[PDB]
Amino acid sequence: VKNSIIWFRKGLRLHDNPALLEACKDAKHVYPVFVLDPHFLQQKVSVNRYNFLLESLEDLQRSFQARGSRLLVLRGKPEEVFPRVFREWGVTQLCFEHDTEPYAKVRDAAVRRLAAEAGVEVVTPISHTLYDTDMLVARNGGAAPLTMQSFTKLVDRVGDPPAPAPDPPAAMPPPAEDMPSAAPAATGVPTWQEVGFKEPPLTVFKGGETEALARLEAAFQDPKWVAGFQKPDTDPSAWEKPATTVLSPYLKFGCLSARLFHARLLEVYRRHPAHSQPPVSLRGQLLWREFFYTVGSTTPNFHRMAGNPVCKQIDWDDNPEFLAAWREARTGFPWIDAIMTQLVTWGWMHHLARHSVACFLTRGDLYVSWERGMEVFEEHLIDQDHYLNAANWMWLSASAFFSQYFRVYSPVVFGKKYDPEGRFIRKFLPVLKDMPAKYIYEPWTAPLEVQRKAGCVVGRDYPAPIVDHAVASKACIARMAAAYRRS
Ligand SMILES: Cc1cc2nc3c(=O)[nH]c(=O)nc-3n(C[C@H](O)[C@H](O)[C@H](O)COP(=O)(O)OP(=O)(O)OC[C@H]3O[C@@H](n4cnc5c(N)ncnc54)[C@H](O)[C@@H]3O)c2cc1C
Numbered sequence: 001v002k003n004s005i006i007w008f009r010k011g012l013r014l015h016d017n018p019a020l021l022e023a024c025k026d027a028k029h030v031y032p033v034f035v036l037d038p039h040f041l042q043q044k045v046s047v048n049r050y051n052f053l054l055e056s057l058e059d060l061q062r063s064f065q066a067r068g069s070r071l072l073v074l075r076g077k078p079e080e081v082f083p084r085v086f087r088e089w090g091v092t093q094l095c096f097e098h099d100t101e102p103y104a105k106v107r108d109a110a111v112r113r114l115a116a117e118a119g120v121e122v123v124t125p126i127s128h129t130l131y132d133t134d135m136l137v138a139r140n141g142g143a144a145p146l147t148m149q150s151f152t153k154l155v156d157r158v159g160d161p162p163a164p165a166p167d168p169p170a171a172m173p174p175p176a177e178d179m180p181s182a183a184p185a186a187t188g189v190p191t192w193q194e195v196g197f198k199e200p201p202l203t204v205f206k207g208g209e210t211e212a213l214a215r216l217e218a219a220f221q222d223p224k225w226v227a228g229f230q231k232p233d234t235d236p237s238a239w240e241k242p243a244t245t246v247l248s249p250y251l252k253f254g255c256l257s258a259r260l261f262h263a264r265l266l267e268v269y270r271r272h273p274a275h276s277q278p279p280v281s282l283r284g285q286l287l288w289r290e291f292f293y294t295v296g297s298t299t300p301n302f303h304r305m306a307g308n309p310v311c312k313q314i315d316w317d318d319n320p321e322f323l324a325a326w327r328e329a330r331t332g333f334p335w336i337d338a339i340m341t342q343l344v345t346w347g348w349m350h351h352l353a354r355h356s357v358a359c360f361l362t363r364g365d366l367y368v369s370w371e372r373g374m375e376v377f378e379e380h381l382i383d384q385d386h387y388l389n390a391a392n393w394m395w396l397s398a399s400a401f402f403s404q405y406f407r408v409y410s411p412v413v414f415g416k417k418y419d420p421e422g423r424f425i426r427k428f429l430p431v432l433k434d435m436p437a438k439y440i441y442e443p444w445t446a447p448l449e450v451q452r453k454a455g456c457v458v459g460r461d462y463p464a465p466i467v468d469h470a471v472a473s474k475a476c477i478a479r480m481a482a483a484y485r486r487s
């Protein structure tokens with residue numbers, strides 16, 4: 001008889017899950033498995049993202065229970081848990097979604113060898129990205145495209161991505177009864193208190209496939225908004241109703257299928273002939289993700305500067321004081337400190353908000369290495385993605401993909417074009433909620449009578465700016481010039 005395991009790592013969904021469909025085919029018992037390292041925190045992981053993962057597992061648990069099954073959360077390392085449950089459950093097939101991250105390739109190769117020793121068939125479909133990224137490299141002549149323009153031409157020669165896979169059956173083969181490793185008390189979804197976190201999560205975005213599909217339908221409620229979507233023209237100060245889809249955390253964990261997203265976009269584009277085109281369209285945003293996944297998976301040391309063949313070697317400053325002020329949202333620029341506060345409280349900011357803080361830290365003002373601001377994002381972002389966090393930090397720091405270092409965002413003027421009253425600043429920096437709009441972007445310029453009346457004295461209630469932007473940006477720009485010619 002066929003006993004199969006569907007191993008969840010990413011792809012935390014039932015829709016468009018060809019690995020799940022294969023595991024259920026002709027199966028007598030199916031074991032939905034997620035593997036959890038109970039010592040992961042005793043090692044840089046905010047409770048916002050980890051609770052988002054736990055909420056996504058609870059959603060999977062309810063979706064399996066409704067179909068006669070149960071999600072098994074196994075504690076331990078996969079190289080140890082799988083050899084045991086292979087024999088205990090009589091497993092004949094192991095199915096999981098392909099993953100191209102560096103740690104995943106090392107981990108999955110070992111499990112494959114353990115599966116071969118136990119006579120277990122391994123099926124690993126691709127469904128996390130739009131395409132087989134190795135096929136894109138092969139069709140381009142053996143190397144990944146290094147510009148978005150050549151990448152868009154490549155995917156148009158290849159054609160449409162595969163359609164989303166059918167829904168799983170209404171009833172699933174359950175796990176076998178009375179298996180010791182499947183005991184309910186040892187395979188349940190833990191809470192954030194039980195894994196060791198002391199402070200609760202503060203983000204407003206709930207994890208899970210159900211929430212992902214609900215947010216997807218909300219985005220497509222106005223097809224003209226989807227058709228005319230232009231990414232650079234969206235508002236980074238919009239927080240009550242964010243200017244973009246905020247589907248990145250669901251696409252990161254796989255709660256939402258990228259192919260389903262792409263299939264719904266083409267349905268709208270077929271009825272709106274003047275729809276936006278890449279790279280600014282909504283489809284172009286999925287292509288940015290596909291582009292960085294393709295170039296990152298094929299480039300050594302992609303998450304670092306040294307040994308990275310695509311990254312420029314710039315002599316960044318080792319300045320712990322600047323990094324600490326930026327990390328702790330006390331730079332003295334309310335626009336910067338408000339975004340960094342949104343990073344810690346929500347785990348998500350608009351793309352152009354990430355532009356503002358990443359430029360300020362690196363090539364714009366502080367000249368701190370993009371690797372340092374990266375690890376800050378890796379801790380707090382609920383949508384943190386190994387390849388997307390990397391490539392965008394190299395973009396913003398003019399280390400790769402982007403080379404126009406004379407374009408420096410002003411930490412004072414940028415947000416004022418969108419939000420002159422500073423509604424975004426007052427929401428995330430309530431210490432400035434009474435400051436008049438004339439000074440809310442430059443509170444050090446307000447007269448003291450205004451600072452006292454507003455209850456926000458610069459240097460006592462809110463810090464003075466750590467740098468002069470005109471002096472700092474002039475120095476950084478000229479140094480980047482010395483870095484770029486000496487290359
Ligand atoms: C310094 C920096 C770090 C970033 N780190 C991450 C990260 O860790 N995870 C992450 O998902 N995105 C990252 N991005 C990209 C981008 O800012 C987010 O994807 C975007 O803010 C998500 O909002 P949204 O889901 O509403 O996007 P939408 O505009 O609605 O786009 C839809 C989807 O397209 C993809 N997408 C959009 N913009 C990009 C982009 N520039 N690169 C790659 N894919 C994109 C995402 O999957 C997103 O969910 C980073 C950008 C910067 C500048």
Ligand SMILES: [Cl-]
Nearest residue numbers: 409410413414
């Ligand atoms: Cl600007």
